[PDB]
């Protein structure tokens, strides 16, 4: 029993983290086979952040200008190119610790683990969700850029996020490993605006199922609802609409608990309309939306 915000084991990603220094800027790089991937703003300075010309900045850099270190060992850069907002540094040594991996672009509402790194060395691992407005609520300081987000399926690491920036909000934005930003953001210090965030309804429901599986059942009421009637209430509380696809995705949890999805929807409707009255669910006094249905099943095997 028990339910915790649980991250993937990070060992396969730890063996890929290197440090990239160009001038006075140092961030993290991802070393896979003979390529190091890192955010392109490693080539910027203070002169170069309102509106950097990255192609201009890059042409003035040699291979030798890129100092790449894997732990105590310098990796010689033999080629460099830019792909969207990431740099690809070809090095002369393939990483012997390269795991089986893929590059994936994740969807809003999906979750992943972040390995927070500074100077190429891991500091901590935590689980994050891609918010509907394409931000993440992470924990990143100066020098954390190039830290990656990932999921593991069996022996395969799916890299899906590389960290680039913090919005003045306190939320974070980055790219996939092809260097394309999630959301309408750009890697420059300009007035950009994150859209309004919403609550990921299918995730809240999955977490209510996790509560039931763990014996926290006080919120189950005797009612049912239609999907249309539920969504009218969800809309009022800034919850995402629940689709039939989401309903099907909750099938395994519904079967395990014997609670129909639309019956759980009726219980969530009452929690939204009435509050929790000082009670908790799985030790939380708020409804949690950063557990996907897959996350719940995986944890509650
Ligand atoms: C990379 O290591 C840093 C990590 C940031 C900065 C430190 C605090 N947390 C964090 O995640 N990334 C940067 O410094 C970027 C550099 C790019 C060339 C933009 N700059 C920012 O993240 C900057 N954000 C903005 O200027 C901005 C305006 C609108 C939206 O974002 C921060 C420092 C305010």
| Cα 23 from chain centre | 29
Query: What does residue 200 show for φ and ψ, rounded to 5 degrees?
Result: -85, 100
| SS (HEC) of 237-280 | CCECCCCHHHHHHCHHHHHHHCCCHHHHHHHHHHHHHHCCCCCC
Report the chain's C-alpha Rg in angstroms: 22
What is the span of the domain harbouring residue 44? 11-91
CATH number at residue 37: 2.40.10.10
Tell me how crowded residue 27 is: count the other CB atoms within 10 A of its CB: 24
Q: Which atom of ligand 1 is nearest to the CA of 144?
A: 2
Say how many Å lie between the first and final Cα of the chain, rounded. Answer: 10
Residue whose CA is at the smallest distance from ligand 1 atom 1: 145
Among 20, 54, 148, 166, which is best to mutate for testing ligand 1, by the most ligand atoms less than 8 A from CB?
166
Residue 193: its H or E element: none
> What residues are labeled active site?
41, 145
Please give the resolution of this entry in Å, rounded to 1 decimal: 2.0
Q: Which atom of ligand 1 is nearest to the CA of 27?
A: 2
- Supply 232's token pair: 């009218």
Residue 62: its H or E element: none
Residue whose CA is at the smallest distance from ligand 1 atom 31: 167
Give the pairing of strands 73-75 and 25-32. unpaired
Q: Which atom of ligand 1 is nearest to the CA of 188?
A: 19
- Dist CA 14 CA 97 (whole Å): 9
Q: How was this structure determined?
A: X-ray
- Dist CA 109 CA 126 (whole Å): 16
CATH number at residue 219: 1.10.1840.10
Residue whose CA is at the smallest distance from ligand 1 atom 10: 166
| Cα 21 from chain centre | 25
Q: Of all residues in the chain, what percent are helix, strand and coil, respectively (each to 5)?
A: 25, 30, 45
| Cα 123 from chain centre | 17
- Dist CA 148 CA 28 (whole Å): 9
- Dist CA 276 CA 250 (whole Å): 23
> What 3-state DSSP class applies to 174?
strand
The Å distance, Cα 44 to ligand 1 centre, comes to: 12
Cα-Cα-Cα-Cα dihedral sign, residues 180, 82, 144, 72: positive
Tell me how crowded residue 39 is: count the other CB atoms within 10 A of its CB: 26
The Å distance, Cα 165 to ligand 1 centre, comes to: 4
- Ligand 1: residues with CB < 6 A are 27, 41, 44, 49, 140-145, 165-168, 172, 187-189, 192
- Dist CA 91 CA 166 (whole Å): 29
């Amino acid at each position: 029993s028990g339910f915790r915000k649980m991250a993937f084991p990070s060992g396969k990603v730890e063996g890929c983290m290197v440090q990239v220094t160009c001038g006075t800027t140092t961030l993290n790089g991802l070393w896979l086979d003979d390529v190091v991937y890192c955010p392109r703003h490693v080539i910027c300075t203070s002169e170069d952040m309102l509106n950097p010309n990255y192609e201009d900045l890059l042409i003035r850099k040699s291979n030798h200008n890129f100092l790449v270190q894997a732990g105590n060992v310098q990796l010689r850069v033999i080629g460099h190119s830019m792909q969207n907002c990431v740099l690809k540094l070809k090095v002369d040594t393939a990483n012997p610790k390269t795991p089986k991996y893929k590059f994936v672009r994740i969807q809003p509402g999906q979750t992943f683990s972040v390995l927070a790194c500074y100077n190429g060395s891991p500091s901590g691992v935590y689980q994050c969700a891609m918010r509907p407005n394409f931000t993440i609520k992470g924990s990143f300081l100066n020098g954390s850029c190039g830290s990656v987000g990932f999921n593991i399926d069996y022996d395969c690491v799916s890299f899906c996020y590389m960290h680039h920036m913090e919005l003045p909000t306190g939320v974070h934005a980055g790219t996939d490993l092809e260097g394309n930003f999630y959301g309408p953001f750009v890697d420059r210090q300009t007035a950009q605006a994150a859209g309004t965030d919403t609550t990921i309804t299918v995730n809240v429901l999955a977490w209510l199922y996790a509560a039931v599986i763990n014996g926290d059942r006080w919120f189950l009421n005797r009612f049912t609802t239609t999907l249309n009637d539920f969504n009218l209430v969800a809309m009022k509380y800034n919850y995402e609409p629940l689709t039939q696809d989401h309903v099907d995705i909750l099938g395994p949890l519904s079967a395990q608990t014997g609670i129909a999805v639309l019956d759980m929807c009726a219980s969530l409707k009452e929690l939204l309309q009435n509050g929790m009255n000082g009670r908790t669910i799985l030790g939380s006094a708020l409804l949690e939306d950063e557990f996907t249905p897959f996350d719940v099943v995986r944890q509650c095997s």
